[PDB]
Every structure is written in structure tokens, then in C-alpha cells.
């Protein structure tokens, strides 16, 4: 059989080169990098090369940190709770601004901070499916400890005005964090242009393994560790390093940035072919703006039949997609989809819809 995977904003396939580069550290190179003997220092060159790939992947400077975490959820929890202790409890800046579109790892943590007494304003989305940047400014009081706005939304693919939010935060002296998970491998990511203090990402959204992530911390910026222990990652995140996943995630970031032109010109062309073909049937409307989007995502809405039925049908024909709040059908492509797959999805989608 031949199945079609169109659920890449939920997770992606590991690139074969990533698995290949991870294998030796699952085999004979199992030393703890903190060890002083040869099994430990034996791992240091590959770890350094992987970290270098990450730094260059997000345009991080040598003075900055790219701390290895276990997923984007850890990065987001670490940002929000760290600034809760450093900037909210100790500096009296008991206010955080974020958006209603943020991943549950951000919104649920913000709810937890609210339970402790922190004041959090979740900026409402507009009809364009985006946040303006004027909204954060309206909400940035002199007690805002942190602004947290995701770079690209996982349900609609919509790109938020990261850069202008960073400029507002820079002029107003408030820390800026961006959840950039959906942006890696989709659009160019530059922490300097974003003026980001914190940036989150997760490997399994750009063809690395599930269970490893990264938090960019700007030079000089403090953040009380979420993982105390003080051994690893310059004492900022303790725990024995996941060497294979570090190497693999480095390679995945490298491949992801190397495929940016292909992502916009080819994957985006497949998404536009799919979307244009799919809107030529009854009343199926795309949910959100069609310009400020990452190249791989389309979110289509169909009459009065729920999206879950359409997805159950698609899955019966071995086509995997997800839902999306509008419910609508989220189809998210990748580097490994082909035009034949897209034509097939147009046919199976139409036949399933009329049925």
C-alpha cells in the first residue's frame, strides 16, 4: 500500500540522514560527555558540530545560548516560569502578555501563573487571523515582565509580525520570547532581526526525533533553571545529555535551513496546487489569510459536515491530516510530499466529500 502523510505540523518523519547520523551514538559511542575518560571526550566534536548547526540555524551569536531541552514544551515552561521567579516575584513586574493562538504549552502555563496571582492578558485574534503588534503595545504596561508571541501558528500556518513586536519590546524594555516551532524549516528564522530574548523550537517538527528541543537565550539574559542540578548546559539545564538526539537535531536544523528555497518554491507550490484544486468544490473556504502563511499549511473548511468525519474518511484511504480550530481540516505538507500525492489527495478528498 501507499499512504499519504499530510500532518507535518503535528509531527514529521525523521530524515534518513538524521537517523544515519544518530546511529553510531546509539551503538559504540555511548559515553557520558561529562566523563573525563575517552568515552566522554570522544563525543565532544559531534556535540560541538551539532550545536554549531543549531546556532547558525537560528542566526544565534557565539555570545548567545542555544540550550538543549527535551521538547518545546520544556522550553516554554522554562521561559514562563523562569521569568515568573526572576521578573514577576522578585521585580514586581506581575504582568505577561501573550496571544490566544499560542500552543497549549504556553497558554496552560500562563493559566498556572494566573492561579498564583500573575496577571496575564491573552491578546484576541482579529479577522485576518493574526495579531497586529499594536495590541502588545496597548497592553505593554510598565509592569509587563514578558511578551510571548508565537512565530507561526500551528493550526492556520499564519505568520505573526515577529520583528515589529520585537521592536516594540526593545523600545519598551520588556523581555521578548517567541515560540518558533512551526517556523523552523518553513521560513527564515533570525533571532537578531526578531530581537528575541527567548526562542523555542522542537526537532520533530523539522524532521528530527521527537523528544528534543531548543531554547535560545540572548547573551546576558537571565533565566532561573527549570532543571536544577547545575551540571550541564553551562549550569542552565541539568541532566545527562541526549547525545544521539543532539547530533540528529543538529543535522535536522542544517537540512531544514538548506531546504528553505525548496520549501517556499516547491512545497508551497504543492500546497497552492492542493488548495486551489480543493476550493473548486461547494462552499469550502480557507480559514485565515492566504499571504502571511508558511508554505506548507492549508486549513480548509467544508459546509456543515464536521472536519473529524472528513478526516476519518481520509484516514480510511490512508491519508493522514488533522483538525484545526475555525472545526476545519488542517493539511500540512513537507519536503517528502510529491505532486502525485497531491493529485491523489485532490481526488480522494473530492470523492470523500461528495460521499
Contact 123, 135 (CB under 8 A): yes
86 SS3 class: helix
Tell me: is residue 156 an annotated ligand-binding position: no
Tell me: is residue 154 an annotated ligand-binding position: yes
Considering only CA atoms, which of 151, 150, 153 is closest in space to residue 129? 153
Is residue 182 part of the contact set for ligand PLP (CB under 6 A)?
A: yes
Instruction: Kindly tell me which of 226 and 300 has the beta carbon lying closer to Cl ion.
Output: 226
Is residue 224 part of the contact set for a copy of itself (CB under 8 A)?
A: yes
Name where the chain breaks: residue before each gap, C-N > 2.5 Å. Answer: 326
Q: x/- contact string, 68-87, with a copy of itself (CB under 8 A)? A: --xxxxx-xx----------
Tell me: is residue 9 an annotated ligand-binding position: no
CA dihedral 273, 278, 279, 284 (to 10 degrees): -150
Distance CA 333, CA 343 (A): 13
Is residue 181 part of the contact set for ligand PLP (CB under 6 A)?
A: yes
Is residue 240 part of the contact set for ligand PLP (CB under 6 A)?
A: yes
What part of residues 49-88 is at the interface with ligand PLP (CB under 6 A)? 71-73
Angle at 184 between CA 190 and CA 165, to 5 degrees: 45
Q: x/- contact string, 123-152, with ligand PLP (CB under 6 A)? A: ---------------------------x--
Considering only CA atoms, which of 326, 271, 337 is closest in space to residue 304? 326
Instruction: Kindly tell me which of 57 and 93 has the beta carbon lying closer to ligand PLP.
Output: 57
CB of 62 to ligand PLP, least distance (A): 27
Contact 27, 249 (CB under 8 A): no
Distance CA 330, CA 322 (A): 5
Is residue 105 part of the contact set for ligand PLP (CB under 6 A)?
A: yes
Tell me: is residue 73 an annotated ligand-binding position: yes
Burial class of residue 323 (count of CB atoms within 10 Å of its CB; 0-12, 13-18, 19+): middle
Tell me: is residue 352 an annotated ligand-binding position: no
Tell me: is residue 202 an annotated ligand-binding position: yes
Feature table: binding site: 72-73, 154, 182, 202-204, 240
Residues that bind Cl ion (CB under 5 A): 81, 226
Feature table: binding site for pyridoxal 5'-phosphate: 72-73, 154, 182, 202-204, 240
Residues that bind ligand PLP (CB under 6 A): 71-73, 103, 105, 150, 154, 179, 181-182, 202, 204-205, 213, 239-240
Amino acid at each position: 500500500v501507499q499512504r499519504i502523510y499530510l500532518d507535518n505540523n503535528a509531527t514529521t518523519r525523521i530524515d534518513p540522514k538524521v537517523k544515519e547520523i544518530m546511529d553510531p551514538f546509539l551503538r559504540d559511542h555511548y559515553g557520558n560527555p561529562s566523563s573525563l575518560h575517552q568515552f566522554g571526550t570522544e563525543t565532544h566534536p559531534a556535540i560541538a558540530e551539532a550545536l554549531d548547526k543549531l546556532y547558525k540555524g537560528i542566526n544565534a551569536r557565539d555570545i548567545d545560548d542555544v540550550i538543549i531541552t527535551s521538547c518545546a514544551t520544556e522550553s516554554n515552561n522554562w521561559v514562563l516560569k523562569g521569568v515568573y521567579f526572576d521578573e514577576c516575584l522578585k521585580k514586581g513586574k506581575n504582568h505577561i502578555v501573550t496571544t490566544v493562538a499560542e500552543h497549549p504549552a504556553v497558554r496552560s502555563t500562563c493559566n498556572f501563573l494566573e492561579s498564583l496571582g500573575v496577571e496575564v492578558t491573552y491578546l484576541p485574534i482579529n479577522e485576518h487571523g493574526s495579531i497586529t503588534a499594536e495590541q502588545v503595545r496597548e497592553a505593554i504596561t510598565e509592569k509587563t515582565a514578558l511578551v510571548s508571541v508565537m512565530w507561526a501558528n500551528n493550526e492556520t500556518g499564519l505568520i505573526f509580525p515577529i520583528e515589529e513586536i520585537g521592536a516594540i519590546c526593545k523600545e519598551k524594555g520588556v523581555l521578548f520570547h517567541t515560540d518558533a516551532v512551526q517556523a523552523i524549516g518553513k521560513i527564515p528564522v533570525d533571532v537578531l532581526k526578531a530581537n528575541a530574548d527567548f526562542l523555542s523550537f522542537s526537532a520533530h517538527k523539522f524532521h528530527g526525533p521527537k523528544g528534543i528541543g531548543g531554547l535560545y537565550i540572548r547573551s546576558g539574559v537571565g533565566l532561573t533553571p527549570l532543571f536544577h542540578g547545575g551540571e550541564h548546559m553551562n549550569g542552565r539545564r541539568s541532566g545527562t545529555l541526549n547525545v544521539p538526539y543532539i547530533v540528529g537535531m543538529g543535522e535536522a536544523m542544517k537540512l531544514a535551513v538548506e531546504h528553505l528555497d525548496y520549501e517556499k518554491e516547491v512545497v508551497g507550490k504543492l500546497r497552492d496546487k492542493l488548495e486551489e484544486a480543493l476550493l473548486k468544490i461547494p462552499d469550502v473556504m480557507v480559514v485565515g489569510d492566504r499571504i502571511h502563511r508558511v508554505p506548507n499549511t492549508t486549513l480548509v473548511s467544508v459546509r456543515g459536515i464536521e472536519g473529524e468525519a472528513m478526516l476519518w474518511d481520509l484516514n480510511r484511504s490512508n491519508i493522514a491530516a488533522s483538525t484545526g480550530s475555525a472545526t476545519a481540516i488542517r493539511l500540512s505538507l513537507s519536503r517528502f510530499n510529491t505532486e502525485a500525492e497531491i493529485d491523489k489527495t485532490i481526488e480522494v478528498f473530492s470523492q470523500a466529500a461528495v460521499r
